[PDB]
Design a binder for this molecule. Sequence first.
Ligand code: HEM
Ligand SMILES: COc1cccc(CO)c1O
Length: 403
Amino acid sequence: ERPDLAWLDEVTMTQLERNPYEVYERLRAEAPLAFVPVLGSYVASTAEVCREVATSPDFEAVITPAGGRTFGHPAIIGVNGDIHADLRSMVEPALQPAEVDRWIDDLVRPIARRYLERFENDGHAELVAQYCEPVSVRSLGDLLGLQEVDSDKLREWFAKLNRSSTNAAVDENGEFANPEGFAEGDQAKAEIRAVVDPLIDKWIEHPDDSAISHWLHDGMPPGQTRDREYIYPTIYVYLLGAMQEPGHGMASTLVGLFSRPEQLEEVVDDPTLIPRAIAEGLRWTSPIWSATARISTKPVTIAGVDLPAGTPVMLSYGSANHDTGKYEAPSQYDLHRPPLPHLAFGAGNHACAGIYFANHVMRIALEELFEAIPNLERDTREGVEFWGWGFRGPTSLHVTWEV
Ligand code: HEM
Ligand SMILES: COc1cccc(CO)c1O
């Protein structure tokens, strides 16, 4: 409907999944708030608009259409008011910085060592499948109480939930263009229920120190637990992004460092720079790229667009983190960029609840990797492909080292 943006009618979902940065570079210049037809939604592409929408008192959280189809209600990302406050109070205890500092090292470092010892003498590895994803899912899985669920299964689940919740394409009538793409999300949820329902049965009667046991029991009257249907959508939210993103963030950081070999050497020589390297990695390729949204609660004007009440806006934080109003040459990974604010963890009342935990998981994993394989090199015979619009990360990362 906006005439000068008629080129957006020809943008495809495949194009956005393969590489969204060219389209979003145009959006940031032409229309920082723009209706993208294949997504069926307004999209915020600049840091200023994303931050305004994410923190505005005239917006509240809304789940994306494909996210709602995947997760249902009450997904912590899609609710507000009293339910959101309860769900935040439910998840926040184990994520509190003082609590994380008590046990994060004894959690992650032995896991990292376990996966490293499977390949650290091979001279070759595919780090996404062999290290970054396993460490990410095993760390969170143990925290949650899913010790018995193999890392391969956790990885499969987040992949299916990723594809289902980002199955956003709509057709000429605004209907989902690929409804069969939700089937694997439904199958993952069915498998998750089969594994987790017996665990919940047990935790209700025999609480333990697992996070999900605490979700059932914390803050409840004596002998009562939160209904499992009330907490399952947030379990699913964890089994997608909480499981996937630390691995994506570590992997993207490594790809970025490999692209700047002098900076890789600096970080290997001085591991106190790992946190800075990760923060630049998250800006450079944001793991949660465009997966959340807000909805206006009253008429509002944003970036010159008059929006009615009830208008959803997707928050494309991954684009905002390449805003050239803020960053010079943002498509280049640069460890020595000044430590400016970034939006890879979102903003506002629905900002990431697990930042401190996530940053430590990624730090410890990279510390142990560089200690075990100080002469790590990228295998330049193999290409690194990034994939994803909603969630983005490298699909593989082949490396080599002299043994
Ligand atoms: C590098 C890793 C991670 C990144 C980049 C990331 C990023 C994000 C982003 C962008 C959001 C949406 C915020 C918004 O809509 O403004 C979010 C939400 C959330 N994340 Fe993180 N996340 C990461 C890891 C984790 C982990 C490991 C956990 C749990 C242990 C977690 C828990 C949550 C929760 C509960 C929410 C929903 C907050 C709410 O809607 O109130 N995240 N995260
Ligand atoms: C913590 O996990 C998530 C954070 C933000 C969005 C989603 C799914 O859309 C997630 O699963």
